[PDB]
């Protein structure tokens, strides 16, 4: 598209993104962010997709210290396709463009990465991202003052038996 950005970096790797529109601005953000934090974002998107158990088994935990399977159940429930679609449909053109640009810029970095700044190169979970994945992250953060604090409790909620 009009995916174009000019990026300047000052001391300590702080990026300064200039673009003529939101798509280009997102493109520069997603690219600069991937250079420093591709593995981090990939891991957190795995979490917010409810795919931790698929890549890591049930023994591990998310960076929020939830067990992988309870975490996956919670995020599968939170980030259902109907919820992501409703959220997307409610977004302004500018915001949609920011998100489209970010996914594209992140993916451009991933296409070119040779491990210079990417310790998880070659892992099967290090994958091109979609705008839906950024909506998954957004919604994960959105509920951190709410149902996110009750993720274990939601998973544990089962009706009484014969006791």
């Amino acid at each position: 598209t009009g995916l174009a950005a000019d990026i300047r970096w000052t001391a300590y790797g702080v990026p300064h993104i200039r673009a003529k529109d939101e798509r280009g601005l997102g493109y520069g953000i997603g690219y600069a962010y991937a250079r420093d934090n591709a593995c981090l974002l990939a891991e957190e998107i795995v979490t917010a997709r409810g795919e931790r158990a698929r890549y890591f088994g049930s023994e591990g935990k998310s960076s929020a210290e939830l067990d992988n399977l309870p975490s996956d159940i919670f995020y599968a429930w939170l980030n259902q396709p109907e919820a992501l679609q409703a959220f997307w449909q409610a977004q302004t053109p500018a915001v949609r463009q920011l998100l489209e640009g970010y996914a594209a810029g992140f993916n451009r970095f991933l296409r070119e990465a040779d491990g210079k700044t990417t310790s998880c190169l070659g892992q099967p979970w290090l994958r091109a991202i979609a705008t839906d994945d950024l909506l998954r992250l957004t919604r994960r953060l959105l509920v951190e003052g709410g149902v996110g604090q009750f993720a274990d409790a939601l998973v544990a909620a089962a009706p009484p038996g014969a006791e």
Partner: protein
């Protein structure tokens, strides 16, 4: 988190000034990242953001700086359901039995053999939202269960909200943009502008219940503990509707705390109440803001801010870099008296000497007195009626304070806490200063980190966990930004404490962390002139 906005009546230059000191994770989905965004002619903003978000979350622009702190407002309500006495998968609303809904999810699990298995899980839902179980507290038995309604699930405005903030010109504009949209999920906003306005807003997404409904709609035993919990068997306890709210069931902007001043506003995660004690914020819903005792970080900030002397940038910086352990102001004098009252008591000798020698700080060089103090305070926190002066609502800045050593049982219990704290410290393996113990691991190296837990009143709040022989930092001071507004353009200084990159391979994995260790803040370059003056300047243009 801490935030201080200073206005024309207190700033040394008569313009606005903002200190942003959010305390947040050093790893993971909430790890701050610095960036400056520009669309020439219509957007120019710099600060830091959470992973995956193409907007600046805390930042500044030509005439404005803003920050956030987590608020004490409720952003959800629990609903206690009255179960159908004939069927625990049904619940009563106005005496009518309704069925729970079921939503199944399926998860793939990688097994011992490396193959995938499919696990199906049923999530039960009521009209309010999903059911939640906290064993021993919120059970699902044959009489009752709990559902949770999260107000931010329908907040589709959150990204638009920050993008709108990024376009704001000054404090008045920021306020208009936040109040119009009501997209902020769970934080306060504090801001200052070039003209010298200082702004505080408790403007977020909060479940709305009209005041007359609260006494009967609350679950008495749960609200007593600060859990927002409502009666789910009465349809009149549904969140209230109001045409002025941006989203059905949330509190209208007009009913949420705002304080606009020209002296200062501050917040360190307490309620709106004592944002500035000269103008207390009172009369809000319990779901919004309550007049509760303030934590030692806010008491510390208020002790430094009250008075009439001009505040310079350097004053606010030093409130962070001093590492003063303000909780010590409340108990150390009496703790020292107890030490002297017990001279020649073997079990207390090292503790008492360490405490007397201590600089009352969480500096790299701070002596073992800090560690003894921390372990003592964790025990003092469990004692009943040990404060000399309990919380006094008419003296909220100075209470609670002191130890009731004149009361025999307290003196005995306090002395025992110190002995116990000292034994725990003697037991662990300590040769050594605070920076020898608290570190951030980078590769196979460890960098000493100043600061201490916010619960001990250290403005520079740092949370750490025991890992092997050290305390490993996991959260706290993160993105630091201190902004003033000289004529040339905004002058911003700070750091990202854990550095830009979480990747050990990166040139920017530990560079600002070394600086954070030495507490050497740096320019945050904003203007083309500042960017161009940087001898490390690098540039890439990309397209597809």
């Amino acid at each position: 988190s801490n935030a201080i906005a200073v206005g024309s009546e207190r700033s040394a230059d008569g313009k606005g000034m903002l200190l942003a000191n959010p305390h947040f994770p050093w790893n993971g989905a909430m790890r701050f990242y610095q960036m400056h965004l520009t669309i020439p002619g219509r957007l120019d903003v710099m600060g830091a953001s959470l992973p995956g978000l193409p907007v600046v979350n805390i930042g500044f622009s030509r005439h404005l700086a803003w920050t956030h702190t987590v608020d004490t407002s409720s952003h959800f309500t629990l609903y206690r359901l009255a179960l159908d006495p004939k069927d625990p998968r049904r619940y009563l609303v106005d005496g009518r039995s309704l069925p729970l809904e079921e939503k199944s999810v399926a998860i793939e699990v990688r097994g011992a053999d490396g193959k995938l298995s499919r696990v199906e899980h049923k999530v039960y839902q009521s009209i309010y939202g999903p059911l939640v179980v906290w064993p021993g507290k919120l059970d699902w038995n044959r009489s009752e269960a709990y559902a949770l309604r999260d107000a931010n699930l329908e907040n589709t405005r959150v990204l638009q909200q920050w993008y709108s903030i990024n376009q704001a010109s000054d404090v008045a504009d920021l306020r208009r943009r936040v109040e119009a949209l009501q997209g902020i999920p769970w934080v306060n906003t504090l801001a200052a502008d070039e003209q010298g306005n200082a702004l505080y807003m408790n403007q977020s997404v909060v479940p709305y219940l009209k005041p007359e409904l609260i006494p009967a709609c609350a679950i008495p035993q749960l609200v007593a503990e600060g859990l927002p919990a409502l009666q789910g068997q009465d349809s009149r306890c549904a969140w209230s509707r109001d045409p002025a709210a941006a989203q059905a069931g949330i509190t209208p902007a007009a009913q949420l705390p705002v304080l606009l001043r020209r002296d200062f506003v501050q917040n360190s995660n307490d309620s709106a109440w004592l944002t500035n004690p000269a103008s207390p914020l009172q009369g809000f819903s319990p779901l919004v803001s309550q007049e509760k005792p303030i934590g030692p970080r806010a008491r510390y900030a208020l002790s430094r801010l009250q008075g009439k002397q001009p505040l310079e940038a350097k004053t606010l910086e030093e409130m962070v870099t001093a590492n003063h352990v303000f909780s010590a102001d409340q108990v150390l004098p009496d703790l020292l008296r107890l030490c002297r009252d017990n001279q020649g008591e073997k079990s207390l000798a090292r503790a008492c000497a360490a405490l007397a020698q201590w600089d009352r700080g969480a500096n790299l060089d701070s002596g073992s007195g800090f560690v003894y103090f921390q372990r003592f305070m964790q025990r003092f926190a469990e004692l009943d009626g040990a404060w000399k002066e309990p919380f006094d609502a008419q003296r909220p800045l100075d209470t609670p304070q002191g130890i009731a050593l004149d009361r025999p049982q307290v003196a005995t219990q306090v002395r025992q806490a110190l002995a116990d704290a000292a034994a725990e410290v003697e037991k662990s393996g300590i040769p050594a200063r605070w920076g020898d113990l608290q570190v951030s691991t980078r590769g196979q190296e460890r960098i000493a980190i100043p600061g201490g837990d916010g619960h001990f009143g250290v403005y520079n709040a740092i949370q750490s966990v025991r890992k092997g022989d050290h305390l490993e930092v996991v959260g706290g001071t993160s993105y630091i930004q201190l902004v003033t507004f000289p004529e040339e353009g905004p002058k911003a200084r700070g750091l990202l404490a854990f550095s830009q990159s979480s990747d050990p391979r990166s040139p920017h994995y530990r560079d600002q962390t070394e600086l954070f260790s030495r507490q050497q803040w740096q320019t945050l370059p904003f203007s083309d002139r500042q960017i161009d003056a940087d001898p490390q300047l690098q540039r890439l243009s990309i397209r597809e």
